[PDB]
Amino acid sequence: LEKDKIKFLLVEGVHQKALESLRAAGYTNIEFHKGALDDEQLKESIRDAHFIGLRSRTHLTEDVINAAEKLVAIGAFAIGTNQVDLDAAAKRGIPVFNAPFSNTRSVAELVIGELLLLLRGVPEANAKAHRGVWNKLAAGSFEARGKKLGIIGYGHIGTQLGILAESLGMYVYFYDIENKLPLGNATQVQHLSDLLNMSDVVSLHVPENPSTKNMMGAKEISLMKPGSLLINASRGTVVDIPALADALASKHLAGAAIDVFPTEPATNSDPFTSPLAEFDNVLLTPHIGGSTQEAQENIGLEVAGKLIKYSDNGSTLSAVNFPEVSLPLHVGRRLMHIHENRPGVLTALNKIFAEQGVNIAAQYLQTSAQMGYVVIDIEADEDVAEKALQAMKAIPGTIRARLLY
Amino acid sequence: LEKDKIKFLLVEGVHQKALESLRAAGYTNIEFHKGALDDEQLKESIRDAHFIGLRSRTHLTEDVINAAEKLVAIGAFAIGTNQVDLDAAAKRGIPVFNAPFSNTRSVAELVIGELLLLLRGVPEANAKAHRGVWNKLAAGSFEARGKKLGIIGYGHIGTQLGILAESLGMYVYFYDIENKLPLGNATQVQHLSDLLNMSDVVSLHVPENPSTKNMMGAKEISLMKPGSLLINASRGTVVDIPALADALASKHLAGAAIDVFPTEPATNSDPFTSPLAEFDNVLLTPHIGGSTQEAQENIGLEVAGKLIKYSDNGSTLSAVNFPEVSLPLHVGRRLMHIHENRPGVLTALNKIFAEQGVNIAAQYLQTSAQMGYVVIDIEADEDVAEKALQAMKAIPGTIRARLLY
Amino acid sequence: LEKDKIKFLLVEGVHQKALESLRAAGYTNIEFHKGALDDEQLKESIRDAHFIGLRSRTHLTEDVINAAEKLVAIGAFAIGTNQVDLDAAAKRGIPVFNAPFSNTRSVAELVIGELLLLLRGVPEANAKAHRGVWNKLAAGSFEARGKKLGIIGYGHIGTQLGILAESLGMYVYFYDIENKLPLGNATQVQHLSDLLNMSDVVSLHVPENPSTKNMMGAKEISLMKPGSLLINASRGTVVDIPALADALASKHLAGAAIDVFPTEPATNSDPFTSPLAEFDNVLLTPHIGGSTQEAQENIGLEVAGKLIKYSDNGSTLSAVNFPEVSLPLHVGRRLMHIHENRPGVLTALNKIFAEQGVNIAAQYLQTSAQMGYVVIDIEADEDVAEKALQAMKAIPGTIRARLLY
Amino acid sequence: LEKDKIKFLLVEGVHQKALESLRAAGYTNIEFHKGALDDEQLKESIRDAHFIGLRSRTHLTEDVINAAEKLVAIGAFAIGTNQVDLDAAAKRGIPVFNAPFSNTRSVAELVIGELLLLLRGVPEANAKAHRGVWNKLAAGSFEARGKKLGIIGYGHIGTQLGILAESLGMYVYFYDIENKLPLGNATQVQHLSDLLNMSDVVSLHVPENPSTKNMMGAKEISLMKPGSLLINASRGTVVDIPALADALASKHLAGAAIDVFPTEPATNSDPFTSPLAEFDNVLLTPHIGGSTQEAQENIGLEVAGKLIKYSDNGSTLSAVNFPEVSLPLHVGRRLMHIHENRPGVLTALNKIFAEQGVNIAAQYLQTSAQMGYVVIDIEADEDVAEKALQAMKAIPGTIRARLLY
Ligand SMILES: NC(=O)C1=CN([C@@H]2O[C@H](COP(=O)(O)OP(=O)(O)OC[C@H]3O[C@@H](n4cnc5c(N)ncnc54)[C@H](O)[C@@H]3O)[C@@H](O)[C@H]2O)C=CC1
Ligand SMILES: NC(=O)C1=CN([C@@H]2O[C@H](COP(=O)(O)OP(=O)(O)OC[C@H]3O[C@@H](n4cnc5c(N)ncnc54)[C@H](O)[C@@H]3O)[C@@H](O)[C@H]2O)C=CC1
Ligand SMILES: NC(=O)C1=CN([C@@H]2O[C@H](COP(=O)(O)OP(=O)(O)OC[C@H]3O[C@@H](n4cnc5c(N)ncnc54)[C@H](O)[C@@H]3O)[C@@H](O)[C@H]2O)C=CC1
Ligand SMILES: NC(=O)C1=CN([C@@H]2O[C@H](COP(=O)(O)OP(=O)(O)OC[C@H]3O[C@@H](n4cnc5c(N)ncnc54)[C@H](O)[C@@H]3O)[C@@H](O)[C@H]2O)C=CC1
């Protein structure tokens, strides 16, 4: 304590729940910033920080990282991590954590909201009325009850959209490359062409990979029904946008709602441009599918939590660049040791304790191609432990070591 | 039999379902127009029409009414009846029907879909995207789940909305002038000003009358929760729009969705205007709160129902310009008499039967200020019912009479 | 008022809500008894009572009734009415009311409770342990989730059992002689033999009529599956009990739960006897399917309510021995008149008013084979009304007449 | 391959599902008995058994354990393990498995079905019917819906019960020693004495330990609601039965249902006794709270699972007499070592590899007071893994070792 000494750098305004999680766990040394940092402020604030929490805007680059001399772990208080040089962090024994599934509710809700209005032609009607034009009609406008919703991608987000969708009395269909257990009354469809053929609304919730690239093409969309609707709040590489423009202006689709795009304005000052901008029957949203207070508080708890666990017990459960290891806290003293993955290391580490008659209660080592990470609980008094820490460090191939408690 | 001679006039493209169930009832004499008729064509095609179904643009004026020789009843295949001269129709013993509550589901689905998006600031963000501005920001966006919906007017629409909002995880509170039995875990607040203080979202669902006129004024809006949303898809008299504008401008409210206005464009070619058109964080819809295909079908089944029933059995249950009468069909010949509300008419009608030894089985007479309407079941031959009808037709004060069967 | 004068006799301890309903409506002249009355106390308490409320134990016999000289209406605060001489009451113009559907919840709950334990062999195990015998086994014992429940009789009770049954994850099947709209996920089965063939538990909810007499016979029960269960909380004539004994002792059925029997102990002191009494795997209950506080308070409100409505406005909606008539309360003064169903009466009644220039606002007459009942609102001051009341009485065929307000 | 040589012994008629999923895993060497084995047959059929699955009557005693030459692991296909000598099994490096929570649904369905009937006084009324007494009386019978269920111990069973009780319309409150996240609209009461004051039905679902021993004593029972019900299907230590008897006798409680007792009959031929056997308004069941066919199948899938896993990959996750170890299967040859918990063993094991240039990929060692258990993945040939195994087997302190693959 010596915890009043362990420093937390937090940028881009994470949720205050992250901060109150740290305090609750006795970590008060917090430097907090609402916005993002230029390099000279970043390189300067980070250099004596044991942990950093950032969002999607800060680039933790190989050099920024090597400029940080006391850095123990990194927390992406967000989903994405590409703003971070994982291999750079990993070579310095710095694990990186994220919040992969902490805003599925926000995405599910957005698609409900959006399909209701698109079904009803409200976006077109809303834009028209902001330009003085009144357009009252029932023809072409539908209720949601009794319509068939097709979910492409039945994961965390796809499944919970399913539930909200039944609650409103929609029939729910879905297609995954994996077989899944239908929830509520949902039905899996074998071929995508059949799902497309009988859905009134189609919503995509797939990840970003060669199999999902331009997955919704001219061909696929020609397979949706006349007057159907396409929503993409997944990833911007998933839908062929020019194919969709053609489909909107020929009126094969009645509308659409898009949140993610092949290229996205780098910041809020840069211009947004898309051929879909000229259609009033389309909703366009600045990749905000997950951008809520509720979600921002979820991520702030999970990721703040994840950092505290690692500080307090060395858990790398769910680290994205690192060997996963965690150990239930039972007995004696905890140490950890990150090193190059080569023979003899673990035996040298344990030999430090066998030689002097010290018992080892538990140990967990896991490896990646090039690196090994181990946690040991040993039974000894403070002194012996301080000293073994010292000896652990000298082991050929040692990257880093720490006495946790 | 007789049913073939009975001509039905349908204008303005009512729902096929009206034709279908008129047909199932044994009514096949039908002139159907998907469009509106012109003075010249209306007056020549209604000349021999026993019934007419119309929508919102056909104007049933005393001129037209008094020319239509054979007319028995009118059906407004809509909620409103301002297009029809109710007083003239009444004067000729012609009941007017409509469908005040066949729109319930469309208005509720609309309120939900709007409150989802406003909470998320999507309308404003969509507006910005369409003009090339990217505004990615999670501050101020909220999930719907966990928030408090405050419903004013817990009737047909209020209650069904509360159900949906509970399926979304919202907490449902309401305020009404009389005491209501709550559905699910909704909660009646006894004072309005508490209902407004606590609500994240307020939605109005009340009639148009002296007591609701500008009921949401500056005072009431100033009581709503800071950063809350107001939604009105009830009627256009109900909310002071200028005061709503001030509330939005000062940022006391974070948005609204208005579907009805103090005055509305008559045609669709007519221009629309509103102080609220200056806000991107406001949804403005052209009074389409009930404009769906499903609603058109509800209205179609129900109003045809009401005409078929009035035809087959004289029921004026739910007529809007008329004494309400209904009588279970059990026995004998049923006869119908419409007359001036003055002493002695009822007696003379019944005397036709008493004096010739004919037993009366049922009779229901109700009155308006000015008119009497009475249905009668008698126990007699066909001949007798026929002569009776003739005598009835000559009772002083008589407006019209009919042998139903 | 003159309401402090109108007397209510209440026997057999109806729920106190009935009493507080009467007070709320200004009727305080209440004689209340917990138990039932012998004839000499009954003939004596009833003779000056305008209304009586009884249960299933008091026999209101033709003579008891004729002994009551001020009796206006009868209320069966229960379902059954056979304890009452309907034709005797009806010939004196006394309508009889009941509570036909005010305990469906109590019956639905009982069958849930009972099928859970029967599935689990708990009744047998419970009786065994009260005799010192411990019998722990899993074989033959099942959970309710995933079992198929067959409802024979999908009415008020059958439908709500369905809902409770799905809540527990049972598959719900049913058979009715009428086509019905399935609730939740319930399925109608065309032939009874198929329902019997695939139900794990079968529960009967049919009325008492020639079509339901011994409906469950040896034949039918040989059609249930080995180890299935039969529950009857409908009527005692519905199930062939000796057929069921044979089926229980051969173990074709694993158990049963019966609440109603062909003959039932006339009172609580008389001996109950049945061949099913020797089976521990059978539940036997003293026709208590509907016997709850909740139900007793429901019936007390409905029936007390029904009496007050008739006193206050002459409504005979739902009277079981009487012509149904009711009139919305609009204008002037209300009178009612019960009479023999013969020509001339109604004309004489209305003539009383036509002759002196008094307007009639509304009238509702309805008839049975032998009797007519009419309600009239007329527009006159107190005096004219008192007098017409007097004249109404003298009309040949008049049974009874009353000035309500 | 090897899997054929691996003999599985199943006694006491476990669920077919155990055989099925053992088979799917590639394990077909199976001796199955639907019944219990006698000393003489058990000891000769287990002699070469690699695994054994048993129930409650087979007594795995140190005599049997130490004779069984080839035994690797034991599976208690039940919740309890008192029949197995855990300490002896541990001493020989033989883990014991069971299924503590495969019974959840059966106990909940039981509590519901019992609370339905007790509220309705059916047990007492059924008891009377069976001896020829008819007791038709609605006073004191209540519907379940609207009443308050008070759950003590909101774990696996507590929570799932609260869900069912909410489907029945009951209000769900709970009390637990640590803070729980409520499901549906359940409500955690912070003081127990408030939970007891307000409850109409109390149900206990807590472990057997020093803190629960007679936790429902005279004091606690006297705090329950007058006319309330107590249900215990947790464990027999938890409730003072004599004091429960006094509460029932004084009519402070209106009934109870007890499934577990301070001592229980061993065989089914043994006699049962309880002061509570004097009450008709008490349900007594022979500790069958989890005795269903479905539970037998759950337990069958799960325990076989645990044996198959320990076989295929060494996981001792959830073993009851053993260090818990689990390791993701990624690379190389996996080896397993069980030994005395004393300095120097770990080091010698790892030295076998370090000194011959063999890379260690993962390792998980956990310890009990007295024993060490460690799994290891190495990067080496088949020959090498084989010689290694031999050397490992000779490390001082070694109890047993195994080349998993
Ligand atoms: N719009 C926004 O602001 C945000 C976007 N997302 C994105 O939404 C997507 C889904 O997120 P989660 O549901 O949590 O991911 P998930 O992994 O839980 O769901 C992905 C599902 O897609 C299925 N799938 C993968 N490839 C497929 C293929 N090519 N064809 C058909 N099905 C396929 C997988 O089997 C899996 O079930 C992700 O790409 C995520 O990044 C997530 C949060 C916010
Ligand atoms: N946007 C659209 O196209 C449509 C608008 N509507 C309008 O919606 C409104 C509500 O419709 P329904 O629920 O069907 O009507 P409803 O008659 O069923 O419900 C009206 C409720 O408001 C309550 N109420 C009356 N005055 C009140 C006051 N002063 N303060 C608080 N509560 C009051 C009444 O007690 C009643 O419960 C009506 O004005 C109707 O014309 C209905 C359908 C479509
Ligand atoms: N156990 C008790 O303490 C009580 C018994 N009951 C009895 O339960 C029965 C059902 O009550 P409710 O559901 O309110 O009556 P209900 O009339 O609402 O339901 C009767 C249903 O049975 C169907 N049905 C009639 N005859 C049939 C036939 N022969 N074959 C197949 N289906 C047939 C009808 O179509 C109708 O849907 C009644 O007999 C009632 O008296 C009701 C309350 C309490
Ligand atoms: N009748 C039967 O045949 C069966 C009996 N059981 C018994 O049921 C009991 C509960 O089972 P599960 O819910 O699976 O256990 P669980 O471990 O999942 O739940 C136990 C809960 O009780 C709480 N608790 C512990 N001590 C407490 C105390 N002093 N006061 C209040 N709460 C306390 C714990 O925090 C935990 O939430 C166990 O004793 C188990 O052995 C389980 C299955 C069948």
PDB file of C-alpha atoms in Angstrom, chain D residues 71-124:
ATOM      1  CA  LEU D  71      -9.179 -48.405 -10.490  1.00  0.00           C
ATOM      2  CA  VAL D  72      -8.735 -44.816 -11.754  1.00  0.00           C
ATOM      3  CA  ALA D  73     -11.877 -42.956 -10.710  1.00  0.00           C
ATOM      4  CA  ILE D  74     -15.221 -43.320  -8.993  1.00  0.00           C
ATOM      5  CA  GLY D  75     -18.551 -41.829 -10.023  1.00  0.00           C
ATOM      6  CA  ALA D  76     -21.357 -41.382  -7.498  1.00  0.00           C
ATOM      7  CA  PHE D  77     -24.370 -41.293  -9.782  1.00  0.00           C
ATOM      8  CA  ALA D  78     -26.222 -39.420  -7.079  1.00  0.00           C
ATOM      9  CA  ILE D  79     -25.892 -36.286  -4.943  1.00  0.00           C
ATOM     10  CA  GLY D  80     -24.487 -38.072  -1.877  1.00  0.00           C
ATOM     11  CA  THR D  81     -21.169 -39.868  -1.399  1.00  0.00           C
ATOM     12  CA  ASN D  82     -21.450 -41.202   2.141  1.00  0.00           C
ATOM     13  CA  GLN D  83     -21.500 -44.743   0.750  1.00  0.00           C
ATOM     14  CA  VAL D  84     -17.957 -44.167  -0.608  1.00  0.00           C
ATOM     15  CA  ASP D  85     -14.842 -43.970   1.550  1.00  0.00           C
ATOM     16  CA  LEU D  86     -13.571 -40.727   0.151  1.00  0.00           C
ATOM     17  CA  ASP D  87     -10.405 -40.730   2.222  1.00  0.00           C
ATOM     18  CA  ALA D  88      -9.321 -44.164   1.045  1.00  0.00           C
ATOM     19  CA  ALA D  89      -9.971 -43.277  -2.623  1.00  0.00           C
ATOM     20  CA  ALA D  90      -7.832 -40.124  -2.258  1.00  0.00           C
ATOM     21  CA  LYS D  91      -5.038 -42.115  -0.671  1.00  0.00           C
ATOM     22  CA  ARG D  92      -4.754 -44.166  -3.849  1.00  0.00           C
ATOM     23  CA  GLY D  93      -4.979 -41.284  -6.306  1.00  0.00           C
ATOM     24  CA  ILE D  94      -8.553 -42.082  -7.115  1.00  0.00           C
ATOM     25  CA  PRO D  95     -10.840 -39.079  -7.539  1.00  0.00           C
ATOM     26  CA  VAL D  96     -14.513 -39.287  -6.620  1.00  0.00           C
ATOM     27  CA  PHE D  97     -17.222 -37.584  -8.783  1.00  0.00           C
ATOM     28  CA  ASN D  98     -20.976 -36.917  -8.296  1.00  0.00           C
ATOM     29  CA  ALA D  99     -23.797 -34.613  -9.468  1.00  0.00           C
ATOM     30  CA  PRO D 100     -24.801 -32.155  -6.674  1.00  0.00           C
ATOM     31  CA  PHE D 101     -27.077 -30.012  -8.823  1.00  0.00           C
ATOM     32  CA  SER D 102     -28.643 -32.381 -11.408  1.00  0.00           C
ATOM     33  CA  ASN D 103     -31.810 -32.492  -9.212  1.00  0.00           C
ATOM     34  CA  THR D 104     -32.872 -28.825  -9.398  1.00  0.00           C
ATOM     35  CA  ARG D 105     -36.137 -29.175 -11.338  1.00  0.00           C
ATOM     36  CA  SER D 106     -37.545 -32.076  -9.360  1.00  0.00           C
ATOM     37  CA  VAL D 107     -37.207 -30.280  -6.019  1.00  0.00           C
ATOM     38  CA  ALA D 108     -38.815 -27.113  -7.302  1.00  0.00           C
ATOM     39  CA  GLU D 109     -41.816 -28.871  -8.951  1.00  0.00           C
ATOM     40  CA  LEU D 110     -42.293 -30.658  -5.704  1.00  0.00           C
ATOM     41  CA  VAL D 111     -42.382 -27.489  -3.570  1.00  0.00           C
ATOM     42  CA  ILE D 112     -44.953 -25.905  -5.867  1.00  0.00           C
ATOM     43  CA  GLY D 113     -47.265 -28.904  -5.981  1.00  0.00           C
ATOM     44  CA  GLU D 114     -47.108 -29.200  -2.213  1.00  0.00           C
ATOM     45  CA  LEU D 115     -47.706 -25.507  -1.547  1.00  0.00           C
ATOM     46  CA  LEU D 116     -50.682 -25.548  -3.871  1.00  0.00           C
ATOM     47  CA  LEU D 117     -52.355 -28.325  -1.992  1.00  0.00           C
ATOM     48  CA  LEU D 118     -51.464 -27.281   1.586  1.00  0.00           C
ATOM     49  CA  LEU D 119     -52.844 -23.791   1.012  1.00  0.00           C
ATOM     50  CA  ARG D 120     -56.030 -25.556  -0.075  1.00  0.00           C
ATOM     51  CA  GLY D 121     -56.037 -27.968   2.907  1.00  0.00           C
ATOM     52  CA  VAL D 122     -56.265 -30.881   0.483  1.00  0.00           C
ATOM     53  CA  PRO D 123     -53.934 -33.297   2.295  1.00  0.00           C
ATOM     54  CA  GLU D 124     -56.097 -33.150   5.364  1.00  0.00           C
TER      55      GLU D 124
END
